[PDB]
Amino acid sequence: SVFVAAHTSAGKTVVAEYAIALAQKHMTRTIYTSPIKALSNQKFRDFRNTFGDV
RNA sequence: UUUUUUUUUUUUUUUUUUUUUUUUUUCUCCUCUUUUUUUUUUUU
């Protein structure tokens, strides 16, 4: 279990997409929670063309 | 001078069967009178 306290936004997302890429090597599912609508779809768009299905 | 968030119309389909109209009651029951019985025959 990991807690992170930093300043840059995407800098914290590296471990997030590490876990996301690790899930398809384990075939499991992961849940990402974003409490705002604008940011909620940007990450989906980022990972759609990047890989897999979101 | 009034921002931000609260998903949506149950899943399923590629199961066998070798009979035949109907169907089941009603009891014994005093017949009145000119008769033997006439008769061939011919014209259809």
* Experiment used for this model: cryo-EM
- Dist CA A33 CA A15 (whole Å): 15
Round to a whole number and report the distance in Å from the CA of A18 to the C1' of B30.
129
Q: Resolution limit in angstroms? A: 7.0
CA within 13 Å, CB half, A9? 4
Task: Determine the nucleotide nearest to A38 by Cα–C1' distance.
Answer: B4
- Dist CA A39 CA A25 (whole Å): 26
Q: What is the 3-state secondary structure (H, E, C) of A1-54?
A: CCCCCCCCHHHHHHHHHHHHHHHHCCCCCCCCCCCCHHHHHHHHHHHHHHCCCC
In the numeric block, which tokens belong to residue A30?
Answer: 């992961």
Q: Are A40 and A34 in contact (CB under 8 A)?
A: yes
CA within 13 Å, CB half, A51? 8
